[PDB]
Design a binder for this molecule. Structure first.
Ligand SMILES: Cc1cccc(O)c1NC(=O)c1ccncc1F
Length: 435
């Protein structure tokens, strides 16, 4: 498993012990063989759970998720998937790891897809070994995998809006429920409906994840309302999962704008991960999984795979060679390897727009490829009238860095910069020259 040119997919069922049992065994064997090793966690929450499983072993934590005492002689590094991809893109030296271990290797965020591409290409080249740990590898068609204890699976209509009647089963429950919603906005309406009925609700999303997830451990709750981010190793002490079976899909229209299409069906892998939150305790059988729709391969044509290609085109591998996507997910995008390769100065702008600007990959690429410099925000105001960003059904307005009030109307429109209140507030700060 640890030999050069080998890529292993450890596909044990959810809760089988990949992180708490198998990962430390692998790390001990890698240290015995003096293999320079990287361990990739999807989120800071998973990184903290990994430190608990690896405690005592000499691991260098390159994350603020944990607070440990290092010796300086560690040959095993632990960081998030995004940090690995960010460091590859930046003019920072990244060691050429002998062993590459990716936990929750099903993560479909662009930086995770790019990390799999870079790693698998190095393995194909005969330069490294890799282990991708996931219950749902790319291409899985089983939404109902094995579990530690039996699960009651029920197809039922699940609310996507506030309700006044017809869903008594939702509130008549006395346990703890994890409910997967298609978006932050949809979660706000369901959470408000449950709060008015006397329930204690915690909401989770990408931006608020580490902070709000702590509340699931620090206080008593009845419902957790979450987006797809909780498919990546987030663990709960719950007895039911309510799953809309829906997600939003970023889609590039006419190569010129990004829209959030849907809500549409989740993939079989996402459905199995959502369901996999329960049935984890062998002593507590009969955890419930209520699902409100079917599965479909909605990852085909999804912007994240095109965005992973933009990132891989700008990562040095060897001379002019460019890393390919991991083979089981390489057909999700019709992109040409190297088509997004930028020249030195535009590449630096592209990286800064993502790292400091916090812009989506696609949008960062349009601005950098147009030859615009990082601090030049004229593009946020000179787009076509149909690119006007709306706030409360009226054009959103910002004071520019020049002191002038202007309508927010970006030259390139990406729906992710204004999908919720928090996102639009961050984009207005960017358009104003505040970061
Ligand atoms: C070693 C390293 C290299 C580069 C970036 C990093 O973020 C770290 N980690 C720490 O400084 C660190 C984190 C957590 N606990 C102790 C620690 F020293």
């Amino acid at each position: 498993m640890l030999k050069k040119k080998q890529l292993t997919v450890l596909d044990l069922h959810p809760g089988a012990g990949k992180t708490r049992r198998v990962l430390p065994e692998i790390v001990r064997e890698a240290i015995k063989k003096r293999l320079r090793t990287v361990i990739l966690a999807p989120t800071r929450v998973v990184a903290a759970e990994m430190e608990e499983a690896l405690r005592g072993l000499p691991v260098r934590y390159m994350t603020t998720a944990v607070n440990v005492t290092h010796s300086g002689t560690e040959i095993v590094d632990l960081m998030c998937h995004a940090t690995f991809t960010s460091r590859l893109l930046q003019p920072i030296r990244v060691p050429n790891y002998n062993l590459n271990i990716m936990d929750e290797a099903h993560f479909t965020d662009p930086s995770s897809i790019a990390a799999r591409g870079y790693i698998s290409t190095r393995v194909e080249m005969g330069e490294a070994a890799a282990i991708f740990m996931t219950a749902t590898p790319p291409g899985t068609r089983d939404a109902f995998p094995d579990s530690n204890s039996p699960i009651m699976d029920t197809e039922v209509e699940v609310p996507e809006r506030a309700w006044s009647s017809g869903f008594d089963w939702v509130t008549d429950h006395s346990g703890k429920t994890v409910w997967f919603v298609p978006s932050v906005r949809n979660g706000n309406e369901i959470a408000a409906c449950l709060t008015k009925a006397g329930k204690r609700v915690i909401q989770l999303s990408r931006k608020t994840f580490e902070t709000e997830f702590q509340k699931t451990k620090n206080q008593e709750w009845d419902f957790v309302i979450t987006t797809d981010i909780s498919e990546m190793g987030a663990n709960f002490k719950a007895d039911r999962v309510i799953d809309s079976r829906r997600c939003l899909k970023p889609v590039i229209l006419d190569g010129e704008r990004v829209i959030l299409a849907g809500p549409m069906p989740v993939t079989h892998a996402s459905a199995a991960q959502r369901r996999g939150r329960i049935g984890r305790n062998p002593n507590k059988p009969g955890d419930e999984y209520m699902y409100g729709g079917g599965c479909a391969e909605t990852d085909e044509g999804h912007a994240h795979w095109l965005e992973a290609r933009m990132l891989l085109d700008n990562i040095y591998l060897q001379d002019g060679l460019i890393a390919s996507l991991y083979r089981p997910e390489a057909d999700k995008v019709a992109a040409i390897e190297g088509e997004f390769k930028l020249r030195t100065e535009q590449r630096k702008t592209f990286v800064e727009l993502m790292k400091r600007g916090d812009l989506p990959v696609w949008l960062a690429y349009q601005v950098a490829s147009a030859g615009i410099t990082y601090t030049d925000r004229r593009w946020c105001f000179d787009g076509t009238t149909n690119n006007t960003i709306m706030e409360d059904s009226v054009p959103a307005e910002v004071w520019t860095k020049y002191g002038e009030k202007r309508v927010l109307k970006p030259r390139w429109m990406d729906a992710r910069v204004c999908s919720d209140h928090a996102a639009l507030k961050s984009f207005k700060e960017f358009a104003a020259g505040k970061r």
